[PDB]
Design a protein around this ligand. Structure first.
Ligand SMILES: N[C@@H](CCC(=O)O)C(=O)O
Ligand SMILES: N[C@@H](CCC(=O)O)C(=O)O
Ligand SMILES: [Gd]
Ligand SMILES: [Gd]
Ligand SMILES: [Gd]
Lengths: 448, 448
């Protein structure tokens, strides 16, 4: 239910976490949480926006219009699987996403049965590099074999020999932590306390988690978290309910990154943190499209009305999706510019789309030479063949990056190290302090 | 392709590993290995056999005939998922199986979307006890929280303080080993070398695995293997290619059990082993049905012809499934009694069927009172309601055991400890040496 569509000649499906995951007690009936912006609306919009550009470009896919069938994943293998069934009930050419790795594996375990190439933008698990199990998977981001290596170089940087380790329950935090503990054993690094926890677990689960970490103090101060954002938020939420501040040195994975929605409200118990982030320049182009949107003109995005209400804390009279948590009426002229922050991985969301465009491009030059539009060869489009063209593609990203894939569907990349600190002004922000590229760790010591 | 059917009023689907899993290079095209007997043909036969009995019984389901749609799983999440799609393309009332835990989770992640109760007979992972993720799952066997506890009591029994740990890649060996290492940390037991490996990995993978284990010698002799049978077989296969005998003390999980197909051919490098086995008396009834089968009269089991050939190393002239590995022609009067060994879990395969029968029984007494057959209430049969009746069922097993479920779909059980040794005669066999029931470990010391 609730699907964002756009008709054309070649349809490209996509899964985006429009809402949060269903509470533990609602999983069976599959009722998703609340509306999301960074990981939801912004991605659905960046989907249409990119397509308009590609369908307006004379070089990329001359007389071929790309359509799209976007579906909500709610960041959960169950709902994401419910929607994938819809994709296989014009046929789909391929799928963009989903977000999580555990959710990606699920969707992949199905799509591969119907020969449908899948390209991710945030799934970074090493397990997906195995092409014997996930033949139809590829991504515009590098696996975590490099991130785990980066995180260890940070621990060796400040001579921390005794650290705790916490990861989010799921194929992401686990596959990443195992690679870390494997490199930690070779380096002679001792793991103090080890634990795991879901992202939707009750506060009591975090109370027990936080307590088990404090018991290892003061020798075990540094805490490595190959964790999702909501997992780090829950931990900071427990640090509040208990009344503890500055007792740990948190070092999180890309799940944290420079995301402002993770530490929003808990800047205090979050200060002094060091994080990891896939190098992705903020797309200058998207801000011009998104900020100009209006509740009256935007009609192709079904979840917009629900978004606008929760976005400005107002309700839409008589509307079906009328929010019963606010009482003041929406004017319809509010500015999205207030408290606006672009999706940290917005750049990858776009190149994942271009990777699908050029894929159909090289295939057209090979199967339908000289022709203008789709020919007998690309009717219908063969998925098994499209997979080969995708892997054999290379182009210049939306922001100027180099995009190509290897034999494992993995793409090259690098990281930027962030340090959350209180600036000269009354504000907490993520400061650019360092980078990591091919075993090289350059950290600015006077900035921390 | 190739489906075993039986028509009736209420159809019960089931997944059995008729063939082995596809080699690593054949997973994408989903081409299964060779025919299986213990985990394949015997279970398909035990399926029909039990149904004939239930449909011949006057008390259990009076005038209601149970049918069945059996499908091959090849013991692989991909093929098992391909077949589940067929189940949801008369409708199915529920599903029996599959075998592995990782494969069970896959099938469960789909069936729960269409409200179809699933009952296993060999899936023992602790993860399946979570009813928020697998609401429609239940089993006639207890989770491994008890087996891991049992294996540790065996290590403490002989005062082994330094042991190695190996498990099969997958939700089974992992969820089981983590529970072991958790209890090992509390007991102050040190884990020497730790490793993991798939069951279909190349011999080189086992050569490297075996080598990494020998390097920890002689202090690390005892080896705990929460491993599948084929994983233990591969290890013994490497012990052969290297020329090592009696260097370890292997202690395996139920994946090994008293199975003769695991150590067949490698009795030498397998002697002196101690295993775990779910208490399940060998069904006296099945042997009378199976051994009397004939290649000419058995027509409801499609995979029989293929089985008979590989069973007696002969080929069927002109037949479609003609085996091109043998040259001598099948007489058709060969006895299945030669080298016959009943499936170790044959008892659970049957009660899983009875658990489905009584489920439809209590539901009939409640929704269609007084009626003879199915009424307006059970047309069609509601899966969500059938789930409640199943959980609230209790009966006497085919061999006299107590069968009932708790709020987590788990069933009570106990284990028998086995010791593989060379008897007085020129033969290697699994000897009954002990039992484990509710924290109590009774091991006969003079029998080992
Ligand atoms: N890299 C994480 C997702 C990080 C995020 O987008 O928050 C994963 O593959 O599960
Ligand atoms: N208990 C194992 C299966 C053991 C076997 O049947 O060989 C599992 O749940 O994966
Ligand atoms: Gd693990
Ligand atoms: Gd910022
Ligand atoms: Gd025996």
């Amino acid at each position: 239910r609730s699907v964002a569509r756009m008709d054309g000649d070649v349809i490209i499906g996509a899964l985006f976490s429009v809402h949060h995951q269903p509470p533990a007690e609602k999983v069976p009936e599959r009722k998703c949480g609340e509306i999301r912006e960074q990981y939801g609306i912004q991605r659905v919009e960046a989907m249409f926006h990119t397509l308009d550009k590609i369908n307006a470009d004379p070089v990329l896919l001359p007389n071929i219009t790309l359509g799209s069938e976007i579906r909500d994943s709610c960041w959960h293998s169950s709902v994401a699987l419910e929607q994938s069934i819809e994709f296989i009930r014009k046929p789909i050419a391929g799928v963009i996403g989903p977000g999580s790795s555990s959710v990606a594996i699920q969707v992949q375990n199905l799509l591969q049965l119907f020969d449908i190439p899948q390209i991710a933008y945030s799934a970074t698990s090493i397990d997906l590099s195995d092409k014997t199990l996930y033949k139809y998977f590829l991504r515009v981001v590098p696996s975590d074999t490099l991130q785990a290596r980066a995180m260890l170089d940070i621990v060796k940087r400040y001579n921390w020999t005794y650290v705790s380790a916490v990861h989010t329950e799921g194929n992401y935090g686990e596959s990443g932590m195992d690679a870390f503990k494997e490199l930690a054993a070779q380096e002679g690094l001792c793991i103090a306390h080890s634990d795991k926890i879901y992202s939707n677990a009750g506060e009591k689960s975090f109370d027990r988690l936080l307590r088990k970490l404090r018991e290892r103090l003061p020798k075990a101060r540094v805490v490595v978290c190959f964790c999702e954002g909501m997992t780090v938020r829950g931990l900071l939420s427990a640090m509040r309910r208990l009344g503890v501040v500055g007792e740990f040195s948190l070092i999180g994975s890309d799940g944290w990154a420079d995301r402002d929605e993770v530490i929003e409200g808990y800047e205090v118990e979050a200060n002094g943190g060091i994080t990891i982030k896939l190098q992705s320049p903020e797309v200058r182009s998207f801000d011009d499209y998104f900020l100009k949107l209006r509740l009256d003109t935007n009609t192709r995005n079904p979840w917009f009305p629900e978004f606008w209400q929760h976005r400005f804390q107002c309700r839409l009279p008589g509307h079906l999706l009328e929010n019963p948590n606010f009482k003041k009426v929406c004017t319809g002229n509010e500015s999205l510019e207030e408290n606006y922050v672009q999706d940290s991985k917005m750049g990858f969301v776009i190149n994942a789309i271009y990777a699908m465009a050029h894929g159909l491009q090289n295939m057209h030059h090979a199967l339908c030479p000289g022709h203008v539009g789709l020919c007998d060869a690309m009717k219908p489009i063969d998925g098994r063949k499209l997979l080969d063209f995708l892997i054999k593609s290379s182009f210049v990203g939306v922001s100027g990056e180099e995009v190509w894939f290897d034999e494992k569907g993995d793409a090259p990349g690098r990281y930027d190290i962030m340090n959350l600190q209180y600036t000269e002004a009354n504000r907490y922000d993520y400061v650019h302090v360092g980078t990591w590229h091919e075993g090289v760790l350059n950290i600015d010591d006077y900035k921390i």
